Predict the structure of non-structural protein 2.
Amino acid sequence: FTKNIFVLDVTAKTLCGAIAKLSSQPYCQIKIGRVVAFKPVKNPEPKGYVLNVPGPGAYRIQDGQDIISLMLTPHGVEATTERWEEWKFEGVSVTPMATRVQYNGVMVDAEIKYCKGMGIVQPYMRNDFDRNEMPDLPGVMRSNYDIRELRQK
Amino acid sequence: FTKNIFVLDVTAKTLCGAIAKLSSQPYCQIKIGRVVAFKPVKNPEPKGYVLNVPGPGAYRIQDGQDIISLMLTPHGVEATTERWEEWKFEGVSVTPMATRVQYNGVMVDAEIKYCKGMGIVQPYMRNDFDRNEMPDLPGVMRSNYDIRELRQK
């Protein structure tokens, strides 16, 4: 099924925000599903996610089993509704809101999912530990094998 | 299926940390499933989660489809593998680790899931906004209805 993410990036540091600013619109719609879309728009839609961000970042909207993972850079947007384990993401807050929203030329009562990103995870950060950044944990010894090489049969 | 959460709470401001400290153990094991358990232990078990926290808070471990929601207070622990949507949580990410650990008193190569929480969401905070807390969002007007009241068939 289709997910609509309305990126609010007021500072315009992401491609999304620059798309939107240059079209004099507050949001950049990212539509993921059978039909894909990137479009600056004036308001979110019913059931839309508003992803308020301060700039570039890896952001994961975790809405139960609805997981949307997004890379927002100054130069591009990449997104998926499917698992994306290779990368780290900031897990953002999802808070439902009762709103009134303009939908197909008419004011309608609608739920919106408010998602506030803090920008604490840089885009395209690999989701494992290099030999240096490996956390020291009591009763946890070193392994010879990499994570990949350990998953076997 | 069963989940094993090993809380590492070194400052011992959570019940978990206090108890681990009192019993001279680094972790507090929380086992969710058919069999439940609360127990101070020396080390995490294979396929286990290390939840490193700095103090009390709402923590949600996000491991794809597996989501573990935990309230760690100074006076209690509460946890679940199912949706817990009345409350806010800090979305905590999983970074898998290739390790060696004691399992049944024996040293084995094992995957552990490392999870670091920052302690920025307090336990038992409603996942909704009072009207004074709502974000000012362009093209987003206020509703007369509640979130709960807007859901209505």
Summary: Chain A has two helices and eleven strands.
